[PDB]
Design an enzyme around this catalytic site. Structure first.
Site, PDB file in Angstrom:
ATOM      1  N   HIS A 113     -11.074   4.443  -9.123  1.00  9.46           N
ATOM      2  CA  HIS A 113     -10.049   3.393  -8.945  1.00  9.46           C
ATOM      3  C   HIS A 113     -10.495   2.380  -7.892  1.00  9.46           C
ATOM      4  CE1 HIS A 113      -8.463   4.735  -5.008  1.00  9.46           C
ATOM      5  NE2 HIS A 113      -9.128   5.835  -5.361  1.00  9.46           N
ATOM      6  N   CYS A 121     -10.753   2.230  -3.216  1.00  8.59           N
ATOM      7  CA  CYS A 121     -10.944   3.618  -2.808  1.00  8.59           C
ATOM      8  C   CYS A 121     -11.501   3.691  -1.388  1.00  8.59           C
ATOM      9  CB  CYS A 121     -11.871   4.313  -3.804  1.00  8.59           C
ATOM     10  SG  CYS A 121     -12.172   6.067  -3.452  1.00  8.59           S
ATOM     11  N   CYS A 125      -9.600  10.936  -7.948  1.00 15.99           N
ATOM     12  CA  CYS A 125      -9.708  10.843  -6.496  1.00 15.99           C
ATOM     13  C   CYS A 125      -8.485  11.402  -5.827  1.00 15.99           C
ATOM     14  CB  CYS A 125      -9.958   9.406  -6.055  1.00 15.99           C
ATOM     15  SG  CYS A 125     -10.191   9.234  -4.271  1.00 15.99           S
ATOM     16  N   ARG A 184      -3.724   7.124  -6.406  1.00 10.88           N
ATOM     17  CA  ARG A 184      -2.920   5.911  -6.246  1.00 10.88           C
ATOM     18  C   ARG A 184      -1.797   5.813  -7.297  1.00 10.88           C
ATOM     19  NH1 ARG A 184      -4.352   2.273  -2.557  1.00 10.88           N
ATOM     20  NH2 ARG A 184      -2.065   2.122  -2.535  1.00 10.88           N
ATOM     21  N   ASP A 203      -7.050  10.113  -3.431  1.00 12.47           N
ATOM     22  CA  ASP A 203      -6.154   8.991  -3.157  1.00 12.47           C
ATOM     23  C   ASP A 203      -4.982   9.005  -4.119  1.00 12.47           C
ATOM     24  OD1 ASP A 203      -7.285   7.618  -0.919  1.00 12.47           O
ATOM     25  OD2 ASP A 203      -8.812   6.717  -2.221  1.00 12.47           O
TER      26      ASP A 203
HETATM   27 ZN   LIG Z   1     -10.162   6.999  -3.929  1.00  9.97          ZN
END
Ligand SMILES: [Zn+2]
Ligand SMILES: [Zn+2]
Ligand SMILES: [Zn+2]
Ligand SMILES: [Zn+2]
Lengths: 216, 215, 216, 215
Positions: free
Chosen positions: D96, D99, D40, D44, D42
């Site tokens: 994850h 999200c 993703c 993280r 994102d």
């Molecule tokens: Zn995500």
């Protein structure tokens, strides 16, 4: 038929049209914006103009393999956004047809190449309606699938940001899911007609239920 | 209204079923299209009426301003199915005068999502800026829709589908045509290609011919 | 290195992090939205976090072959629209790198398959800057091309509806075109930095002119 | 600010050039990645820190909610280059918890363009409605991001790229992993596939295991 014949056909068609009615080409420029967007298959078995009796100028057209409205296909989404927001079409018709090569290839899954990725969106529909399809004779499943495909593409079209915004703002846009058999060329309304979010949802379930009752 | 379309269709279908039932039998009998037509969603004059081709002879793709974008999987999927599966012998890209997409690419109104698609026309416009500057301003939109066709033919020829088909000796001819909405007369932009040599030579031949027409 | 080793590495990395600083995983959820969107190459030769010293949580990342921003690529456009309109990132960095397989394949044109269509967008850049490239030694052209590619992708990003709207509405978003050589990992600013439509155009020509003066 | 990034990079580069100049020489020496990571945007926890993999070992694609859409040519081009050109041995799709894309797909705020991309998650959500209804409402978002990974693995296995690679006996394993942002621990969703049998059996195995975990 060769290319030289097409250029010659065209020259004759225009000359016969100019001499009989010279205003024909003048009028078309003056004719109002198209009121209909037609999303159909690249097979174009019967042209939309002959199926509906609509004049050139009344239709804005998109054609792709198996008349899909994929959530993230910017080609179709750009035609839809221009039609709805710029031309302000009043109707969008998604039309499917029997004997569609794309639909048949999605089920039979020959190794055709690149096109198989596009057809996986039809395989998704086949899986979504597996219970319904399993209740009907196997020889009817391909016919049910092209009609289910239309209804799912209308459902996708209604869920697009373009249609959600247009409807939320009260714009007058009706979406239709139609289909025709090549055996008669008769347009059948799959009854998923939607003018807003409420009729999109109600219409979708109404069309699936009616198809289920037709084949089972 | 919608009831009129259903009414027109019913009468049309019944009329054909009664006068020539063999028409739909002939429709049900599969005879693969020999032509792929890539045209504009404006569809000012339908391809069947422009060319006199019968519907079974054509496979059609239509999008705003008849583009063949290198990475548009919708058009590429139509082209790959047409070339590898149907084995069409001809691909015609046809543009037309007074195209809303071409006009919006130049005028650049804030139309929304469609502006991103139209940036591919703005790319072409910039590419031919010197050529366009050599002609009267009032002729530039007309030159642009013809230049657009030639560039889309050039993209089509460079796609993996066409490079693979020509390398294996498949017979596929690509054409760049255009018509004015004032007469509906098809004009060959002379970019016709059957292989890599004619793709390159044809492209420069078409640009040079357009330059000589407007300058 | 096998899959079993990755799962084991992960278990050890988390356990050592939890025992030393249990707050590390707590803090990250609390940490503010990322302020930067990084558009880089799938090669990911040096990760963006190590190149810039930015922490995980400060970056939103997109990676594709040769770090392109194609006008009609809805994957990249969806990352950009979410980053600009939803996360409201303050900076977008497009970063290219030397020795990029995608850039080299665009020029050498091996028959790699599907990927060749994506790489035709790089071939477009090679053609656009043919006069500039012809003025410099042939052995320098691939290095100039990956930097020209970055500047063109920044130019595309600035012309997208997302950036045009954000800028017209006065949102604070700066777009950057950076590149690094794998021989030193040093980020070089290609000087195309844009905060609005004026600086997008001026910056683009400034960057092309500076590259031209560097190689010629 | 931006000056801090340039400052951090300068000091980082000078530090490596001085302490180990061989680091960049080893970087310049081509050693093809063995793994494709689809994660993703994102990001993280970066993939390199999660797995302990060295940057040269990974080829990476990131998009909102780590999707493999049947017709997304951006992801398909990464996959085709990774499988046919780099000949990666493993493809890992990693999702994850927490999200933003998954949460927005369910909550459906009017975010703009991104909502169209998120309709592919809404498709998955509808697909597993019966399974999701059998668990507590507060667990459904967690189940959804794991179900999303498994569905993307299923799409990846069905792509022409993976079907062709497996039919020709190429060694490529596809994995569906997930991690919670609460511990960064990678969890194997058990949909691991090396061929068409394990793709189908693995998919149903993963769905059944998730169902047994939450119900
Ligand atoms: Zn995500
Ligand atoms: Zn069809
Ligand atoms: Zn047009
Ligand atoms: Zn690269």
């Amino acid at each position: 038929k060769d290319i030289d014949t097409l250029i010659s056909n065209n020259a004759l068609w225009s000359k016969m049209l100019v001499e009989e009615d010279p205003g024909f080409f003048e009028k078309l420029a003056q004719a109002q914006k198209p009121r209909f967007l037609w999303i159909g298959c690249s097979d174009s078995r019967v042209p939309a103009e002959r199926l509906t009796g609509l004049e050139p100028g009344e239709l804005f057209v998109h054609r792709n393999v198996a008349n899909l409205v994929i959530h993230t296909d910017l080609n179709c989404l750009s035609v839809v956004q221009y039609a709805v927001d710029v031309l302000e079409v009043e109707h969008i018709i998604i039309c499917g047809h029997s004997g569609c090569g794309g639909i048949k290839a999605a089920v039979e899954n020959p190794e055709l190449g690149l096109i198989n990725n596009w057809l996986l969106h039809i395989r998704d529909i086949w899986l979504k309606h597996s219970s319904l399809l399993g209740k009907m004779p196997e020889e009817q499943r391909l016919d049910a699938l092209y009609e289910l495909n239309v209804m799912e593409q209308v459902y996708n079209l209604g869920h697009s940001t373009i249609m959600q915004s247009a409807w939320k703002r009260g714009q007058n846009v009706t979406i239709h899911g139609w289909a025709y058999s090549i055996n008669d060329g008769l347009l059948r309304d799959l009854d998923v007609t939607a003018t807003n979010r409420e009729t999109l949802e109600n219409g979708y379930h109404k069309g699936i239920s009616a198809l289920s009752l037709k084949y089972i």
